[PDB]
C-alpha cells in the first residue's frame, strides 16, 4: 500500500507520523531530526504539548539542510480547549505557527470539541474543582477555522476526539463552507472504534488513530492496566511476520485505511516504528486483532466529565 491518503481538500497525507506528546523538550528535537532522517514526513504536535519551539528548531534545521522540502512535510497542530472563542482561534493559530517557525500548517485540529473558559491555565478550574466552560458554540470555533484556510495559514482544518453526533453537528452546520479533513481519535486493538470509523468513512473524513501503542508512559497509568506490548497473542502474530509488537500495533491501523501517529523520542524506536512497509497482516490477522476490543479507552480525560460537550458519554 499506498505511503499517503487523500484527504477530501485534495491533499495527500502520510498514514505515517510521529506523535509528540510527552516528548521531553530536551529530547524532541533530536526525535525529529531523527524522524525525518530516516523518512517519516508527517508530525504530529499541539500546543497544549509545550514543546512545538523545539519541534520546530528540528523542522527548520532539516529543511535548511535540504533533507527534506517544506512541500514533503505534512505539520499538524490542534486548537487547544481555552481558545474556542472565534477571537482567540487565529492568535492560537499563529502562536503555534510562530513556534513552529512556519508560514503554514498543513492541518490543524480542534483538540477536543469541549471550549473552557481562555486564560493562562489550559484546564481552568472553579473552586470546587470543575472544568470551566466556555459558552461558544462549536460551530462558531469551525466558522473561525474556516477563516485559517481562507486567510493562507492552514491547508486543512479537521476535529479530534467528536463523537459521531459532534461530527454529525459539523457537516449539518448551516452555510458549512469546509467539511472536516480527518477526525483524530483514540484507536488500538483493545478500542477498535469500528462504529465511529465507519461513519467518518462514510462521509469522506479521513481517520487519525492516536495511542496506538496504548500509551504505555500516560501518567495515569496502573501497573494492573491491559498492556498491548506485552499481549503473548499479538506478540505471536508479530513473530510470525517476524516483525515486533509494534510494528503490528502500527501496521494494524494502516491496513484499516487509518492514518497512525505512534509516539517516540527514541532513536532506535523512531526508525523501527518506521519499518511497517514491507509486510501484510493477513484479513484474518486483522479480525483476530478486531477481537480483542475491550472498549478500554485510555484517553478519557476524567477531568471534563461534567462538561456538556464531553464526547465519551455516547456509546460513539
Ligand atoms: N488528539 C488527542 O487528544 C491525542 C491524545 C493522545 C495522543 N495523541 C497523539 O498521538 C500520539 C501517540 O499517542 P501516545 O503518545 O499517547 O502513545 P503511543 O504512541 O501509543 O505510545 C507511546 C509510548 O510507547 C513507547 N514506544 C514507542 N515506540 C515503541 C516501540 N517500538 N517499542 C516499545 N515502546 C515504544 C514510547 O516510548 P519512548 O518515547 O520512550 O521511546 C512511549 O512511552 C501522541 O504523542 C500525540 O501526538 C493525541
Ligand atoms: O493530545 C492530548 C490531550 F489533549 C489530552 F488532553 C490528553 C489527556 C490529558 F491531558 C489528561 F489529563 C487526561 O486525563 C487524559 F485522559 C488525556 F487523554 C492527552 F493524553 C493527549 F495526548
Same mark, same amino acid.
Given at each position: 500500500?499506498?505511503?499517503?491518503?487523500?484527504? +477530501?481538500?485534495?491533499?495527500?497525507?502520510?498514514?505515517?507520523?510521529?506523535?509528540?506528546?510527552?516528548?521531553?523538550?530536551?529530547? #524532541? *528535537?533530536?526525535?525529529?531530526?531523527?524522524?525525518? !532522517?530516516?523518512?517519516?514526513?508527517?508530525? !504530529?504536535?499541539?500546543?497544549?504539548?509545550?514543546?512545538?519551539?523545539?519541534?520546530?528548531?528540528?523542522?527548520?534545521?532539516?529543511?535548511?539542510?535540504?533533507?527534506?522540502?517544506?512541500?514533503?512535510? &505534512?505539520?499538524?497542530?490542534?486548537?487547544?480547549?481555552?481558545?474556542?472563542?472565534?477571537?482567540?482561534?487565529?492568535?492560537?493559530?499563529? /502562536?503555534?505557527?510562530?513556534?513552529?517557525?512556519?508560514?503554514?500548517?498543513?492541518?490543524?485540529?480542534?483538540?477536543?470539541?469541549?471550549? &473552557?473558559?481562555?486564560? /493562562?491555565?489550559?484546564?481552568?478550574?472553579?473552586?470546587?474543582? %470543575?472544568?470551566?466552560?466556555?459558552?461558544? +458554540?462549536?460551530? !462558531? *470555533?469551525?466558522?473561525?477555522?474556516?477563516?485559517?484556510?481562507?486567510?493562507?495559514?492552514?491547508?486543512?482544518?479537521?476535529?479530534?476526539?467528536?463523537?459521531?453526533?459532534?461530527?454529525?453537528?459539523?457537516? %449539518?452546520?448551516?452555510?458549512?463552507?469546509?467539511?472536516?479533513?480527518? +477526525?483524530?481519535?483514540?484507536?488500538?486493538?483493545?478500542?477498535?472504534?469500528?462504529?465511529?470509523?465507519?461513519?467518518?468513512?462514510?462521509?469522506?473524513?479521513? #481517520? *487519525?488513530?492516536?495511542?496506538?501503542?496504548?500509551?504505555?508512559?500516560?501518567?495515569?497509568?496502573?501497573?494492573?492496566?491491559?498492556?498491548?506490548?506485552?499481549?503473548?497473542?499479538?506478540?505471536?502474530?508479530?513473530?510470525?511476520? %517476524? /516483525?515486533?509488537?509494534?510494528?503490528?500495533?502500527?501496521? &494494524?491501523?494502516?491496513?484499516? +485505511?487509518?492514518? #497512525?501517529?505512534?509516539?517516540? #523520542? *527514541?532513536?532506535?524506536?523512531?526508525?523501527? %516504528?518506521?519499518k511497517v512497509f514491507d509486510f501484510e497482516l493477513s484479513s484474518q490477522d486483522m479480525t483476530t486483532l478486531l477481537s480483542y476490543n475491550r472498549n478500554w479507552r485510555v484517553c478519557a480525560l476524567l477531568s471534563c466529565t461534567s462538561h456538556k460537550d464531553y464526547p465519551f458519554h455516547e456509546e460513539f
Amino acid at each position: 500500500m499506498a505511503s499517503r491518503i487523500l484527504l +477530501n481538500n485534495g491533499a495527500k497525507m502520510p498514514i505515517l507520523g510521529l506523535g509528540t506528546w510527552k516528548s521531553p523538550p530536551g529530547q #524532541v *528535537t533530536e526525535a525529529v531530526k531523527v524522524a525525518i !532522517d530516516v523518512g517519516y514526513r508527517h508530525i !504530529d504536535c499541539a500546543h497544549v504539548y509545550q514543546n512545538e519551539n523545539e519541534v520546530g528548531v528540528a523542522i527548520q534545521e532539516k529543511l535548511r539542510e535540504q533533507v527534506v522540502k517544506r512541500e514533503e512535510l &505534512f505539520i499538524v497542530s490542534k486548537l487547544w480547549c481555552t481558545y474556542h472563542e472565534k477571537g482567540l482561534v487565529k492568535g492560537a493559530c499563529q /502562536k503555534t505557527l510562530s513556534d513552529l517557525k512556519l508560514d503554514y500548517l498543513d492541518l490543524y485540529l480542534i483538540h477536543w470539541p469541549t471550549g &473552557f473558559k481562555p486564560g /493562562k491555565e489550559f484546564f481552568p478550574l472553579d473552586e470546587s474543582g %470543575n472544568v470551566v466552560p466556555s459558552d461558544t +458554540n462549536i460551530l !462558531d *470555533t469551525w466558522a473561525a477555522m474556516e477563516e485559517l484556510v481562507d486567510e493562507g495559514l492552514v491547508k486543512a482544518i479537521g476535529i479530534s476526539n467528536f463523537n459521531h453526533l459532534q461530527v454529525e453537528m459539523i457537516l %449539518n452546520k448551516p452555510g458549512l463552507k469546509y467539511k472536516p479533513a480527518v +477526525n483524530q481519535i483514540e484507536c488500538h486493538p483493545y478500542l477498535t472504534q469500528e462504529k465511529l470509523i465507519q461513519y467518518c468513512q462514510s462521509k469522506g473524513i479521513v #481517520v *487519525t488513530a492516536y495511542s496506538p501503542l496504548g500509551s504505555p508512559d500516560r501518567p495515569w497509568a496502573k501497573p494492573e492496566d491491559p498492556s498491548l506490548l506485552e499481549d503473548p497473542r499479538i506478540k505471536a502474530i508479530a513473530a510470525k511476520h %517476524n /516483525k515486533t509488537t509494534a510494528q503490528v500495533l502500527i501496521r &494494524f491501523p494502516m491496513q484499516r +485505511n487509518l492514518v #497512525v501517529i505512534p509516539k517516540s #523520542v *527514541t532513536p532506535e524506536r523512531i526508525a523501527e %516504528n518506521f519499518k511497517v512497509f514491507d509486510f501484510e497482516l493477513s484479513s484474518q490477522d486483522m479480525t483476530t486483532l478486531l477481537s480483542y476490543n475491550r472498549n478500554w479507552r485510555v484517553c478519557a480525560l476524567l477531568s471534563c466529565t461534567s462538561h456538556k460537550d464531553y464526547p465519551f458519554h455516547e456509546e460513539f
